[model samples]
Target chain A: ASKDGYKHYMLKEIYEQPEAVSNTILASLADGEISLDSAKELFEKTKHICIVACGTSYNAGMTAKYWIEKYAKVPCSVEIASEIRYRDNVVVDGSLFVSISQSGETADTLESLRKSKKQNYVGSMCICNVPNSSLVRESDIAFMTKAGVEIGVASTKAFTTQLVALAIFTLVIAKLKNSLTDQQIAKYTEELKNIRALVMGALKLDTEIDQISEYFSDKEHTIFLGRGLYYPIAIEGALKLKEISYIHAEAYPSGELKHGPLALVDKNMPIVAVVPNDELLDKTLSNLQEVHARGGKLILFVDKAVKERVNFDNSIVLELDAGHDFSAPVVFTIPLQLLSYHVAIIKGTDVDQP
Target chain B: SKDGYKHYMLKEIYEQPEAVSNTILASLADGEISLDSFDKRAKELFEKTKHICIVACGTSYNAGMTAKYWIEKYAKVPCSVEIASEIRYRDNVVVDGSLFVSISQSGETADTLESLRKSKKQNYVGSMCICNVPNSSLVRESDIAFMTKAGVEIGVASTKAFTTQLVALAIFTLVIAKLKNSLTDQQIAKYTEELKNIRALVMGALKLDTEIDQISEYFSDKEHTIFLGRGLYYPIAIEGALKLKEISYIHAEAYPSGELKHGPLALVDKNMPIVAVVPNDELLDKTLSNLQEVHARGGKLILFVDKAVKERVNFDNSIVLELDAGHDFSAPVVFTIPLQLLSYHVAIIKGTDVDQP
Candidate 1:
């Protein structure tokens, strides 16, 4: 409930992410195996997973789609809760309706879950922070995120905890769907167990991110770009900047740069590019060069290995360990949170309430 | 192509009424939605279709979003929309018997075309192409192709091309609805009658050019803008935002109206102009409530609403441009005209290169 000596609650929450993710992961581990508790039955029966959420929770769902589809081999869909309620959505017979929320009291997401219950879904579940909220009580099953008391409205600890819980949930579904071997599951479980260390590594970049924020605080607009799994991370980063700093920020899949958004790039608008060391790294770097050619300023959060590759003038580059391929999204998010926090501090805006 | 207009963008903006009508008429025969080109194969593919996934880029992607509403509502099929570039790189979990649809203006958009080709290797029932150009690579490769029939759109920012794509998608939705037996004969007739009436509704929207021009004067000096809409109009808001940014160079963004409280509301202030499309549908009250929240925050409000609902939703501080009433389902196409004109007039006022920018 207190800032715990941190200047703002949001910074405390950002620093609290390592323990929050650890606590979240520990709750899902039983004898070094991933457990969904009673929700295992729903996962076993799920032929498809339909995720509904809004804002930050919605971006969390988007990141989950990549993991669920690639690792679990399950067809996954994500929808914004507010728009889904008004549309005539076709729910598959064996689909599982999953909703993610921090307060578990988001009216739009709650209403979406309520409306979805009347459809043909086989089961309904929620990944929420509060155990006794309506979403948890009303859902057929629940996987509670253990990031307790997220008081800073910008939502830092809660978001990473959501990702941590969903990563574990993805492993559970992968095992249920027979997409992973026993050794593969154990390997991933051990990797997930090391998430606290990975998060700590990202937090260690705090000073470097703060210096980068000094350059960003004066800018009025920003564009965040990423591809593959990091695309949703880019969007969440942009939302944080806009929510706290009051800067007009936009995000796009890096592959979409030439389609339209490339028109907005200039020296006035800085571009924050999330580059993880994965297969899409090369393509994403090429997209960054597209911005560079147009005199756009670049702020890069890249894997340490690729530091020599993304060299560009008129930019600030920070490095982080991309970690396990499955863990990159969670690892990449820490610096984004710190960057927004420091930028908001420099702009003299309310980091917590704004 | 200028046809006495100052620029091809304006001339094309004026051509939207005929473009939409021609696109609609091509798919209708004997007062029914008759897509003769796909009469047999479309029925076969649609009958076994369990889901739909649409891929496109930019404005076409916005069109795909609007069609997702129509296809799901009338055809009762689960539909998912995605950007072509993202879907191509990711490991897309393709449902068995799912139909893959691609929408593009040139029919040669590389990302969209490549995504269509990627769908070929998946477990899809069929692929459909909706594009303005005939016999282009996208059309030549897909299992079935439907032309938007909006002849030769020369404007760099899409105008008639986008509206015609909406009309083409509407026809395709109706065809699926008929095949699925989700719509009755009477319902089909009613919807087609509504589609036939779009040309006149659009002409009415185009008539508000002077009012939109006056509104443009307020926007030329602004560096940022926000567009808000609810339900189907949300995609329309995105399309509108893209048009403004593409032509007028304003950094405009769109949001689903209800999402304002979540994050973007922090960016709203007296200096920020909020453009919204207010339809007299089930969402009218909710959309108006969101606008009132913006107004309360001293945000500049420019609204496009049907003449039927202006009195109830009007505010002294807001500039509400009223258009003639149209069907709720047609609001995306009908309300699009004024947005296009607003961007055009704003670009002219700002002295930007209207066609090239």
Candidate 2:
């Protein structure tokens, strides 16, 4: 590729994911130290942590909230920038405000950071790709993603790089808190490094994703289904479809599907199932069967090893190469995003701008 | 009979003079009604009441928020206002003497009626309604009713009915305040006289059309607007912005002026019109100071003030319309008239539908 090949910058950036993931992993591990001393010091200073951002950054923060509460045992809350600024009762005392931004120039995000800075926060840190952007300058400490230049407005490489950075940040805090064992650390690091190859292997399923998009492009709405960490990725996928395709899509944790969203399902509805071959595989499979029995079209993104085991004649499987469950977020998100992009592109909508 | 206006919204907005006059007259009309019935029943109810819950949808909900401030202030009643949609899903607290009040123009809104039905089944003593439609379902369902004389509102965006709702609420507040023995008889009589002249004062305030038209020109093209107020006027600010958004299709928001920096301040710009309700009351000085902050940020402001408080603040870019000092309840009636005019005229100037939804 000619150092950024296509006439459009989005295509060039989409093809740059392998390099982005490799660079982010290397930058995270370059110091030959996995200790989260700085993060631990920061976390200890504050009684609580609040993550504020917009769009993809918000989803990344939501996923990290689950990890932080589980591993580091720190209470965390994630809020969208616009909603957080308007509501009055959100707690801001003795909390660390962590703002995640790729561009760092998102208007509402910068505004929210400035407002929170005036409150009783102990400190603030920014996880951003743009080093000297507005949010990074305003924050107390800045962590650069090392994802390199992302020219796409829809955010492909930048988002995956954010996941890696957040994972590294989480692990650092867990290590400092002695929450993870040496073997567990080694396992996670090894699995993190193997994500780029798995993502590249996942990219090979683009043809299946495009075919699946053909079936869904005409639908007015789509629902993305997942659980735990993958649920936030499902949210991002739904947001991408709504932003680009104008197809009123929503994402819910699989547990919440029965609570309210299940009422909207019918023959016309298409459910994009983000099922990985994890411990929750059977639960996810059962949920997919529910959608199937309700006459909803089921499009599955599954690990290649489990594709044959869970495959049904009526289901469309967009298979991913076998990888550790820790790396599945990076692997599975790519095809769903591309599926949304191709659907919007085939529908001749404004793909990049939208 | 058509009054030379092209639409009922404009006609209804222009009818503010008659509407405010009618509301004031209704509150101040000569009748020696039994305070004993109100005092004995309302006082016992007020003492035992743990929460005063107000429910409505759209513009009426905004009015309920205003009442929340008033009830908390005068009767020392703890109150909360909720949109019907939100209260429908959540489990609510219905204490021994909780009073569920529903404010609606048509009184036939499904959600509002449904919420009333739901609250009736709970552990609440009774319900009341501030309704414009006297024979509507909500009026029949409630234990007591305060019928506002706003007549029929032909437009989808409520104008006169909202002010009438606030007037009825203020009268209801006066009744409760009397029962609670919070106000002196002289204070009540003075305010009752002011309530009687509210319509004439609002009619006089309506004559400032040329000035408000000038202010409306600055905001006609803007995509977003924000309204701010504190105390009882905060809900009026909310209702003002809702009128702008529902009719003009501008993306508008309202916030308590003290909480501006929390989020809405970021959206403020030279292009953003910040409408501040500057009443001539105890909160006048504090609200003026908040408007100055908007001014320092180079924001354009439209101040709704009364004649008595006009000299307190000065601004080069600000447009001020003065109303008669009148009663506390009368102020909402006067302030809301110009707001309705501003939204109607702006919609007309912007070529939006002034009558239809």
Candidate 3:
């Protein structure tokens, strides 16, 4: 802790992952919170949930949409705030707008919240890190994550903190909708606690991440690839790299690889493959092989069980501890975020400002 | 060759006068446009067309967008420009009397050609192409073709090809306007002469190289920049940013002045340079007010204004480059030169790649 001093706000915030995750777990188990009550009414009043945010917030919304829809049996849509605020579209009747923002002051998200409210949205909620912001004040309900001040503009702990709040919010909504079994709830809650140590294990690959990012720093273009839950993380990773490094980066689900982005691959291109030791490992590796055959440099972040399967001399692996497939999305993002930070640092870019 | 300007983009920037002259000379060729089967068919189809749909990609798309404004004002036809990549994915309305004009430089861009093919498959009434390539697939696939004589463009960041496309589209607009009886014959003749003189005006504008090169210093240090404009100039702003992104590797974005508050206004600050395209027209007042909004937010304003609107706005922390305002078609070509110069000079000053992709 003394190397950078956990005394500094940014470093302290980075090491506060354990408590952030635990507070989220405790909040999920706590009785009669505003979110738990609102979830009950939200499911009753709205037919669908529309998640709106920008950048990292948008990625959190994507992860949450997958969880809530799978657990609570509700359809969900996630939109980028910039696009939503500009274009008019059909809003479903009895819709709930859930805006996610870490700063809670993202200009586009606040404007979008106001616009949704003006269009007679039945209910609105903000999953925010800040306690009292324009977005939180305007929303019908607010789910505040106890993740303290985040100073690093690359957003390390703030991102995972948002995920934790989203997970709690999802569980509360699931429980309110009577969609979660007692057994499932207990298991998920227990598994989420172990995620902190799993994340710490993932963070141990910092040296390797620094080395891999050095390889990527010189490239002008890159692609981040993953599937299912990790797809949104891939999007978030690409956005961070682009925002800071100013690299022309893009991300897509592995399933869509053959569609349009495949044409962009060649020896000069580098692809950051986010592979977890889950059901999607084999499929993701196959996609990596395709990239390799086309001469793309593959940077793989794999789990312990799949580490052997990702055997390639060209690949750099960030090994994660074995965890449930459902929790891997939250754990896998840590190293990718670090990779973006280190790459931006190597590129001599203004990461904090970007 | 011995002049030693850094790269081809700089060379191309200096060649705008000749490019503009070549386009104007081609547009007013000795005889009237031969009403061949292709031209006659297009004339008959476009005469009955109630609206226009312009489909293109990148810089060519920006040219099509500027033509939308010209077609609406002069030809009295409602026009909309769609990026070819977006048009390929979405379900769109196919109006009864609408024409799809595909603008391309290479004419081999898969998305643009695919969009035209898809529109045809959906039973579009007519298709026309304004392209630089004479025998390219876009020309072969379309019902009519207006070839621009801009020659082969080696640099991926398009400059001459875009201006040539604008020239071709402006001629198409005037032709349709004449066919619809929207313009008096005297007005037609007046515009024709103005179009002929545009080449010389653009040639003169190109001579402001040392002035524009000096202004590029303000932008060379910035990591990101925004280009903003209103109406026809809005598309020019988009093209300017596209050029900057392609060659200079800067993260540049463009937004219409009316739509700035919708999202991009939040991105403005002292570090962010706002390149605005302010033409001398009815929209000048609105654009000037938009510039004030940018100024209030501490944006570094770089204005491309005509002489007419020079005194209207108090240009502070703004470099106002003047241009000749003869006709609607001429405004786009004249305004676009400084933008190209700005991007080129910025890239040269920053030691970034200016020509090779």
Candidate 4:
């Protein structure tokens, strides 16, 4: 019933992202010694992880898969709970089964966890916002998210906090599997600590973000683009815009621009992109150039390191710094979350309800 | 240089029965799988595979996703699918003896080829490539190659090549199961016969084009559409949405039917049109219950269903285009044809250049 001080619970929750992420970062770490003893034991000799969730939780699971595969040398599968519940799961032997949900009461996730249990999985775990929801009750291990009381029908803080939990889980798996050295763990741990501040800095772009939502008000359709780990981030952004603004929005990997979406791209369509400053920058830039060549207008979330790559004429760049600390993707979600939020505000819809 | 059809897309859309039959015939000649066509290492790898990884892009990616359903159920190996462009740089872990498979029409799709090359450096047991091109880079790089008979896809939006890709992957799925000693010789032959007879089922499905043309009138004026499916039908929904997006320019999104209640269901109303692929399977009752919920919310329901299921599901505000019951393996391939025609008709109404799109 409380909107705090904002116009709506949506805006209040929008501002709550930084503290929510901060609360979740150490939500797992005990007083000092960094103990996730259960994960270390549960994941012993685990070569793969299968993650199940739906909607926003599914996106967080994919971002987790990207990190776990990269750092832990463990492949992971992310599936929509409903689809996995119906189909025969192609599960690897001894792979850890994990579910992600904000409500923990999600029917699909709980049913999927139960079905996975029937497979006799090595271990089952859940990352959920509600502490004692059915998913957590069914899961052998439960990691609770601290995004307290998301009143908005559209999820904002809950999603970012879910990402925070997955990032922490990935690091724990990395350290337990001996893939992250003590020195490297310290480096990533310090970088992981920077997520809260980076989120703090990210919210500063909202003033600029608020001014640009008008550009999209008259537009009826849009596209979001990202590659690799951020592809699901693109999907999350599209879902947020569509759910709140009632606009028809879709997302694709930047590399897939030429495949099918290019034909639909012209001056009339809008392209919103996230360019993380990493080794894939050159390839991502080439896709951006094609979108530029085709005269598709741009709204980009750019890293400070990749700022020069954008040709400035028709594009609007919301700049931020990438986390050298490895939580760059989690930090990048902040600006997109705000962009869709403000766009919904400008479209004059009930932001808290729709 | 020209056919009687107004556009190449139309002609290609009409070619489904023959095009898909060509793929089925090639794989099922003499009433059995051509195990002799695969190389020695291909056989060894199939027997040793601990996991199956399929890498593709766009339409081919949907084919890979659909195959994960078949391979996981039939081959008894854990199968995972990836969009080739994103997976190349993802640094995914390889199981001790996994088979890396690539599906593409043109063997030269940049990212798919890149992923195929990347797979070579990893600890994989072997690689298999299913391509329409005989000796393109993707085929040349793989230890096993299955050349599709969907020759010369002239339309930019692939019709025959996409169906043929599904057929090729389905054949491979049966072969892999045989190698695992999971299917009896009698069972393989029985399944082969069903796959071959899918051409007749596709012909039966082609009869729905007139009905689809009528349904597409509703699609043309709508700027947005939602496609829903379950299990193997999930990727079929994605392919249907993609066809609508590329040609008709409608912004179409697909969701698993059971998962629809979670988010996309919010977008459903009397004005919102729903495309449901309702095949008759174990999940038919569950899928219909989901559609019933959508219909209750006043979402316009247009279903592509099997005739056996028509009696069980009906809505006051819905239309059904039913195909005769057929092989579950071939159902996805056959159901795709009508959606392609529906999108093509909608594109024609909108005055878009179909072949170029």
Best by DockQ: 1
Q: What TM-score does each of the candidates earn?
A: 0.98, 0.53, 0.56, 0.96
Model 1 scores a TM of: 0.98
Better of 1 and 2 by TM-score: 1
Over all chains combined, what TM-score does candidate 2 have?
Answer: 0.53
Listed per model in order, the count of residue pairs whose N, CA or C atoms clash below 3 Å is: 0, 1, 0, 0
Chain A TM-score per model, please list them: 0.97, 0.91, 0.90, 0.96
lDDT of each: 0.87, 0.72, 0.73, 0.82
Show model 4 residue runs off by greater than 4 Å: A30-33, A37-39, B1-3
Best of the two (2, 4) by TM-score:
4
Best by TM-score: 1
Query: Model 4 over residues B180-279: C-alpha lDDT tens digits?
Result: 8868888888878877887888788778878888878887678778999998889999999888878887778888888766567667777888998998
In terms of DockQ, which candidate is stronger, 1 or 3?
Answer: 1
Q: Write the per-residue lDDT of candidate 2 for residues A79-181, one digit (tens) a residue.
A: 6675455433234345788899898887768888888866777888899998889999999877778777754546788888888887777676666666688
Cand. 4 Cα-lDDT: 0.82
In the range A260-353, model 4's lDDT, one tens digit per residue, is 6887788988899998888888998898899888888889998888788766578988889867525778778777778788888888866775
Give the Cα-based TM-score of candidate 3 against the true structure: 0.56
What's the lDDT of the predicted structure labeled candidate 1? 0.87
For model 1, the docking class works out as: high
Give a tens-digit lDDT track for model 3, residues B1-357: 514756666666666667766765665646232224236687688777876788887678789878876786787775667667545644454555768889998888877898988988765678999888888999999998888878765554678888888888877877888888878878777777767777777876787778988988887677678899766777888888877766565657677786555245556667888888777776667677778888988888888778777788686667777776555778888888888888888877777666654
**Candidate 4 local lDDT, residue B271:** 86
DockQ of each: 0.81, 0.04, 0.04, 0.63
